[PDB]
Design a protein around this motif. Structure first.
Motif, short mmCIF file in Angstrom:
data_model
loop_
_atom_site.label_atom_id
_atom_site.label_comp_id
_atom_site.label_asym_id
_atom_site.label_seq_id
_atom_site.Cartn_x
_atom_site.Cartn_y
_atom_site.Cartn_z
N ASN A 1 -16.45 81.03 -36.34
CA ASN A 1 -15.08 81.32 -35.86
C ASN A 1 -14.57 82.52 -36.35
O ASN A 1 -14.65 82.40 -37.54
N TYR A 2 -14.38 83.43 -35.55
CA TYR A 2 -13.67 84.69 -36.13
C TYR A 2 -12.20 84.78 -37.03
O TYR A 2 -12.09 85.56 -37.87
N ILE A 3 -11.59 83.69 -36.74
CA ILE A 3 -10.21 83.77 -37.54
C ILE A 3 -10.80 83.15 -38.88
O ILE A 3 -10.54 83.67 -39.89
N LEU A 4 -11.46 82.16 -39.02
CA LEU A 4 -12.27 81.60 -40.37
C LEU A 4 -12.99 82.69 -40.84
O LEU A 4 -12.96 82.89 -42.16
N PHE A 5 -13.72 83.37 -39.95
CA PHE A 5 -14.60 84.54 -40.64
C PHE A 5 -13.67 85.50 -41.36
O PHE A 5 -13.99 85.87 -42.65
N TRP A 6 -12.84 86.21 -41.00
CA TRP A 6 -11.74 87.17 -41.65
C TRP A 6 -11.05 86.46 -42.67
O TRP A 6 -10.81 87.14 -43.77
N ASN A 7 -10.59 85.27 -42.72
CA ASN A 7 -10.05 84.44 -43.74
C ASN A 7 -11.28 84.44 -45.04
O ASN A 7 -10.66 84.90 -46.09
N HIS A 8 -12.39 84.23 -44.58
CA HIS A 8 -13.59 84.21 -45.52
C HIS A 8 -13.73 85.46 -46.22
O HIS A 8 -13.70 85.59 -47.28
N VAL A 9 -13.30 86.52 -45.22
CA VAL A 9 -13.50 87.89 -46.07
C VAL A 9 -12.28 88.09 -47.10
O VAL A 9 -12.77 88.75 -48.16
N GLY A 10 -11.17 87.82 -46.58
CA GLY A 10 -10.34 87.97 -47.57
C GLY A 10 -10.58 86.97 -48.96
O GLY A 10 -10.38 87.70 -49.91
N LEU A 11 -11.06 85.73 -48.65
CA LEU A 11 -11.42 85.24 -50.08
C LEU A 11 -12.69 85.82 -50.94
O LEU A 11 -12.50 85.94 -51.99
N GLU A 12 -13.33 86.65 -50.15
CA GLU A 12 -14.55 87.39 -50.67
C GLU A 12 -14.01 88.40 -51.63
O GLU A 12 -14.29 88.58 -52.66
N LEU A 13 -12.98 89.07 -51.08
CA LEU A 13 -12.35 90.25 -51.82
C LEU A 13 -11.82 89.46 -53.04
O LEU A 13 -11.55 90.27 -54.01
N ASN A 14 -10.97 88.57 -52.75
CA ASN A 14 -10.37 87.93 -53.87
C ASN A 14 -11.28 87.61 -54.73
O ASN A 14 -10.92 88.14 -56.09
N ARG A 15 -12.52 87.02 -54.81
CA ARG A 15 -13.36 86.75 -55.96
C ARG A 15 -14.12 88.08 -56.69
O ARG A 15 -14.09 88.04 -57.78
N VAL A 16 -14.48 88.81 -55.79
CA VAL A 16 -14.74 90.05 -56.17
C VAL A 16 -14.01 90.99 -56.91
O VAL A 16 -14.48 91.59 -58.01
N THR A 17 -12.71 91.04 -56.62
CA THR A 17 -11.64 91.74 -57.37
C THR A 17 -11.59 91.21 -58.51
O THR A 17 -11.04 92.24 -59.54
N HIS A 18 -11.61 89.96 -58.77
CA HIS A 18 -11.26 89.42 -60.04
C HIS A 18 -12.68 89.49 -60.97
O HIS A 18 -12.78 89.16 -62.19
N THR A 19 -13.71 90.04 -60.49
CA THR A 19 -14.99 90.11 -61.17
C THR A 19 -15.28 91.34 -61.48
O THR A 19 -15.60 91.75 -62.56
N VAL A 20 -14.64 92.27 -60.76
CA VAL A 20 -14.78 93.88 -61.37
C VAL A 20 -13.46 94.46 -61.57
O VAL A 20 -13.43 95.51 -62.21
N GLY A 21 -12.19 93.55 -61.68
CA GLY A 21 -11.00 94.10 -62.15
C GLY A 21 -10.56 95.17 -61.12
O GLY A 21 -10.28 96.26 -61.42
N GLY A 22 -10.43 94.85 -59.98
CA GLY A 22 -9.64 95.75 -58.76
C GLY A 22 -8.45 95.45 -58.44
O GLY A 22 -7.74 95.17 -59.38
N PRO A 23 -7.92 96.08 -57.28
CA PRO A 23 -6.57 95.77 -56.99
C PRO A 23 -6.21 94.23 -56.60
O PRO A 23 -7.21 93.51 -56.23
N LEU A 24 -4.88 94.04 -56.51
CA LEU A 24 -4.52 92.62 -55.95
C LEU A 24 -5.16 91.42 -57.03
O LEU A 24 -5.13 90.36 -56.57
N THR A 25 -5.17 91.69 -58.30
CA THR A 25 -5.60 90.70 -59.04
C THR A 25 -4.32 89.66 -59.64
O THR A 25 -3.27 90.32 -59.24
N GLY A 26 -4.49 88.56 -60.17
CA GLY A 26 -3.55 87.76 -60.61
C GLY A 26 -3.11 86.81 -59.32
O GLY A 26 -3.39 87.07 -58.49
N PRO A 27 -2.28 85.77 -59.63
CA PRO A 27 -1.88 84.66 -58.62
C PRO A 27 -1.00 85.32 -57.88
O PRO A 27 -1.19 85.26 -56.50
N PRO A 28 0.19 85.63 -57.86
CA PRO A 28 1.14 86.15 -56.94
C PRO A 28 0.65 87.00 -56.17
O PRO A 28 0.74 86.98 -54.84
#
Length: 574
Positions: free
Chosen positions: A18-45
């Protein structure tokens, strides 16, 4: 750049068809990767904000192409205010490509290096590798998108157009800035966590092994009061926490909170720890405290919501169902916008009160018979690293987890009431889920014996593996409740940071002192009986206000839903 080997996600492969779920998944992937590499948009809020922006963009792109009947687009194409004017399709009619354009543009704007000036000061903390790793995710997502991505299509271009408006309007580049903030020590006052009072960070992110420098992190102390809200139609406030202002006289409540904190959230081997092994599981399950390969709480909440979405979809076909596409586009927009605003108000209140965390409250209590100057908590897990558990670098009241959960799950409840079952808006629902696994307890992630190696899969790295626990939940009311109390079990939050003690604990004949079992462990009310009705006063405002994060989140979700997901009036923005 060696691509970081990301561990497998525990969810059906069909979800991503499902493409809506796919893009959500991509957003989630960036979420975990940015917290692994210390990128932008880190932290809860801010991580929540990223997802809210992503889904708002996806929402308007989709619904512009496939106009809804029961609601409208967040932004209007006929708005005179350019900042709020939604682009028009003008012929474009491929919702799949529109969503792709919106998703890709938004995520790229959010995670790519802000070379345009912002690189200095704001972005001057993220390494090139961090950006490179995030780029890898972005680039392959284009190739993985179900149905493909056609950058040349009018629909794709329209989607990008939509994302541009939302990014320009809602992006908060320096939102998490701590410049100028410093704790003001004293009783009940937030200050640097005693087990991690200062950290040594490289002077240059691009030179991780070069000279270091002391760093005292304070996570987004001004965000809540300055940032633009998404869909809330008013400011939200909580009652003064026990020991402060109008509630400074709630000593029995505070003293009991100290007692409960020690018994329920202490380190595993402490003689004073009365928490059970199962409760330790409940505590870690909801963590997602910005760890490597895991990310922040908003990621877990979305993982759960994805399951709820598929479990309760109207049609079997996940790939070619506009009914499902619309359903998901709407659900995630509502949920992630609610999560974003929950992050804003929980952070606003957190820094307004600057209430100290349990570790400091217990250690610095000062009274020989009440405090424990050497207490240790179970703590926020430092997963996929050899680092010791810690305490999130921000105030305790209210709990971010509790608020996020209240907003996310109340939104789910309001959305599914009448479809999945029937219940009073503020009473237990029946939105059950099963086979729900937390990456904090999945039989793969671990507490490493040496620093994390980003070039090797996690399973090839020595460490103690987290027990795989597959859960079933009876409702969103339960999810909301457990998510909140998890922080009590971890020892990172006071009972009132979650909700009014009266609403979640079993009372005794002694006022403000709650029931404990034969071993001294706190007894909780049955989920089916829990009602968040206990309100308190504020020194600065008239009336009764909610206590803790759960009630706050619930109110935010209800307000947003009731208004049908409409922009926060510009007049009431900070």
């Amino acid at each position: 750049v060696t691509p970081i080997p990301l561990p497998k996600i525990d969810e059906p492969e069909e979800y991503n068809t499902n493409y809506i779920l796919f893009w959500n998944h991509v957003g989630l992937e960036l979420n975990r990767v940015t917290h692994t590499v210390g990128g932008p948009l880190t932290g809860p809020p801010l991580s929540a904000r990223a997802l809210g922006m992503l889904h708002l963009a996806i929402h308007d792109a989709y619904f512009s192409i496939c106009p809804p009947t029961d609601f409208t687009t967040f932004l209007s194409p006929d708005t005179e205010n350019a900042a709020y004017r939604l682009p028009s399709p003008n012929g474009a009619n491929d919702a799949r490509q529109a969503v792709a354009g919106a998703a890709l543009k938004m995520l790229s704007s959010l995670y790519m290096k802000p070379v345009e000036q912002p690189n200095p000061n704001p972005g001057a903390n993220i390494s090139d590798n961090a950006y490179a790793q995030l780029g890898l995710v972005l680039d392959r997502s284009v190739l993985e998108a179900p149905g493909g991505v056609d950058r040349e299509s009018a629909s794709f271009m329209f989607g990008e157009d939509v994302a541009d408006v939302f990014f320009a309007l809602l992006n908060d580049p320096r939102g998490a800035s701590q410049e100028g903030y410093h704790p003001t020590p004293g009783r009940y006052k937030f200050d640097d966590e005693p087990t991690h009072p200062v950290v040594l960070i490289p002077v240059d992110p691009n030179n991780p092994n070069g000279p270091k420098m002391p760093f005292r992190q304070y996570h987004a102390p001004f965000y809540g009061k300055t940032t633009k809200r998404f869909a809330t139609q008013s400011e939200h406030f909580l009652a003064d926490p026990p020991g402060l202002r109008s509630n400074a006289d709630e000593t029995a409540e505070y003293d009991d909170a100290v007692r409960v904190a020690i018994a329920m959230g202490g380190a595993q081997a402490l003689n004073s720890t009365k928490r059970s092994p199962w409760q330790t599981a409940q505590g870690l399950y909801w963590a997602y405290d910005g760890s490597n390969l895991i990310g922040t709480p908003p990621r877990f909440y979305n993982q759960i919501v994805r399951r709820i979405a598929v479990t309760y979809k109207k049609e079997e076909d996940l790939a070619n169902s506009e009914v499902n596409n619309a359903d998901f586009a709407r659900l995630f927009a509502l949920v992630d916008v609610a999560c974003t605003d929950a992050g804003i108000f929980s952070w606003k209140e957190k820094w307004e009160f600057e209430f100290w965390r349990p570790l400091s409250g217990v250690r610095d209590d000062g009274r020989p018979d009440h405090g424990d100057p050497f207490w240790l908590t179970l703590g926020a897990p430092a997963t996929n690293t050899n680092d010791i558990p810690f305490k999130p670098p921000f105030p305790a009241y209210p709990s971010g987890h509790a608020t996020f959960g209240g907003a996310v799950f109340q939104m789910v409840r309001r959305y599914y009431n009448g479809r999945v079952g029937t219940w009073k808006d503020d009473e237990p629902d029946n939105i059950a889920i099963d086979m729900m696994i937390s990456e904090e307890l999945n039989g793969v992630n671990r507490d490493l014996r040496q620093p994390y190696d980003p070039t090797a899969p996690i399973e090839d790295q020595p460490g103690i593996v987290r027990t795989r626990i597959v859960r079933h939940f009876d409702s969103a009311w339960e999810l909301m409740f457990e998510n909140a109390i998890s922080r009590i079990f971890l020892g990172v939050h006071w009972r009132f940071d979650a909700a009014a003690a009266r609403d979640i604990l079993i009372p005794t004949t002694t006022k403000d002192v709650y029931a404990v079992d034969n071993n001294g462990a706190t007894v909780f009310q049955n989920v089916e009986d829990i009602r968040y009705t206990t309100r308190g006063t504020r020194e600065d405002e008239e009336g009764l206000f909610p206590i803790g994060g759960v009630p706050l989140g619930i109110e935010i979700a209800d307000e947003i839903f009731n208004n049908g997901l409409k922009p926060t009036p510009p007049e009431i923005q900070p």
